[PDB]
Design a binder for these strands. Structure first.
Lengths: 68, 132, 68, 132, 132, 68, 68, 132
DNA sequence: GATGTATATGTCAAAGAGATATACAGG
DNA sequence: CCTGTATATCTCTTTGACATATACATC
């Protein structure tokens, strides 16, 4: 989709299109900057978007080459 | 208010298996979890040396992103140079990377969350938990 | 991190904290739903759009003339 | 998040020849890559001295918009003025713009992605990768 | 409230000669004067390549620390690469560091203060002074 | 000499021994870091320490070698 | 930078701006007078002091390693 | 303003011998030297396992009190974790602490000053110097 | 009572963060 | 008209900077 950003009284916000608005009225959200991206998330589900994203390669860390 | 320093072993194990019992844990304890910057280097090493450095640096980088990465500071280097010596004064061996994570959590009051418990017991004054 | 939802004339909105607020008044961003999450990015993302684009620049920088 | 700093020569080539393997690399390392504002200067120049500057000034905006363009700050200066003295001793300087794009990367440990390997290998403390 | 951005010739001269009028002017214009990092690079180069590198870097430090080091950022890039081009149309060539200063001072509406004024005049639309 | 630093409710301040305190024609001041030091000057005089102190070297940047 | 002068019950003082403050631990500094200014530094100043202070033990790190 | 980063070898040598060709630079390059918190973690260990742990501790705390000790932070970890993968691509092994030193010193543009010039040779894009 | 030390509160303003209001599109 | 697009305002509470209190501490 495509939305806008905007300033309030010294606060930078995004305008949420009515289609993808958050279910329920609701309370507060979490946010994280990945890259030049921002993920928004309801409280208690911050890690979901990472578990359900792409996984690491089978070869990833077979070995953990620590010394002794 | 952080409580939990995830070790490299947990990190690695979660990256490979993305288990469900970890995923509920990670959701409850979201704003109390970190890793030492010592771990991060390992994660980084492991991705670069892997057969998919771009794919695995992204997965790390979203894994990194959702927690706090603590700098191995002075208080951490004093506390591991003390935990490392009295470890020799008793002859039990633990890895140069594993001493630093144990010590860094030790230097700040955090409990190490590991799945190599047996190798973390012999470490003086440590607190330990397993989430796998 | 933490932030908060709010209404701006019946339109719903999220407050970007200044920690991870966006640099310019780059006014346009691309929103999406991932699961119950939302991922927000500036508009000039895809590197293909620039490869599938203009600018033959046949005369352009036949030389760069740096004063070596 | 960043690893690669794209040299001018590399950028010029990607503009003129717009290859395919580069597109592949580019698509792997999006958000890993960057240019110095030294370079961004040099591009703007060329577009402007060309025929049909509106054409090219346009095409670069899409180029640099899809990158990060890193400012040439204090540490970047300091690290560049040091590397500039060492090649004075050796009697082998490099181009003045090349000396700056070098030390910029060098003040943050990035790897210069250039394609004039032979000229940039004599810069002290340099890492190089070549994509052309 | 910065209004002045001294040139390399300006700064070199102040260091070697520490005249008196220049010290009164410095004292009156404080916080209204700066330098481009491009001049900072030339200044630590000159100190390194000197026959007294640590003494010279300690005068340069006392110098930057009392005034400002504006980063040669992206807005400063465009300005340099524009006037870099229009000087090619007009066939008069200007030094690269002197032309990267110039493109910085204008991008932030600033007075170039120099002592090679006849050199700099060819630069379109730059406001200059001397203090030597 | 020797003195202490201390906190006045939220500002970290140094105490000035009476011997080297600031005269009556000096009533508030400037302050500048050079290394692990801080210099404290009355207004209008921050360069006075720098002009009077360490000089450059004689050879220091006779030439400049800008790539003509 | 600009800062201030003030009286702590009798003693004259200056407030360090927070950007150029000293670590909260550091309590003792060395004040000295150059012309009309003052300089402030922390107390472990001279590398002369440490060479002329004490000595290591004979055996101290006659070895050092872990898995090279 | 920071230029040098003492390897652990250097600090040991200087602590043990207190040379006069060591005192040379320390006075000149004071306020340009520092050590990675890693190097501190080694020193503390060595004092702590020593037969005069309070004299040997007491000299150290004076040693590092006249330097700055830089925290192993997130950029230092990424950089080590890249160059550690390069050393694997090319078989050159370096000890885990000295490359953490390496990966720290690199990430900031500093010159690691060691005396083990013979395997500080190889670590990609390094800047050694030999005060011994 | 000159000289240092500590902490106990004061106001004052800017700023990040919230909280509402209620203008005018332009399909 | 309804999303959107803007604007205004109003609370709060924090915090850095600016001031006045003496607890007294001793010599």
């Amino acid at each position: 989709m495509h939305t806008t950003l905007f300033f309030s009284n010294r606060t930078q916000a995004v305008r949420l299109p009515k289609s993808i608005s958050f279910p329920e009225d609701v309370k507060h959200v979490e946010i994280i900057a990945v890259g030049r991206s921002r993920i928004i998330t309801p409280v208690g589900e911050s890690w979901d978007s990472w578990f359900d994203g792409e996984g690491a390669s089978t070869d990833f860390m077979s070995t953990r080459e620590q010394p002794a | 208010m952080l409580k939990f320093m995830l070790d490299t072993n947990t990190c690695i194990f979660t990256i490979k298996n993305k288990p469900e019992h970890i995923r509920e844990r990670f959701n409850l304890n979201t704003s109390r979890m970190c890793i030492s910057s010592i771990t991060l280097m390992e994660l980084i090493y492991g991705a670069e040396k892997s057969l998919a450095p771009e794919r695995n640096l992204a997965v790390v980088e979203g894994f990194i992103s959702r927690l706090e990465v603590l700098d191995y500071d002075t208080q951490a280097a004093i506390h591991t140079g003390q935990i490392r010596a009295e470890l020799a004064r008793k002859g039990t061996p633990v890895g140069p990377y594993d001493q630093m994570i144990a010590g860094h959590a030790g230097s700040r009051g955090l409990v190490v969350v590991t799945n190599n418990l047996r190798e973390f017991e012999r470490i003086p004054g440590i607190r330990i938990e397993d989430w796998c």
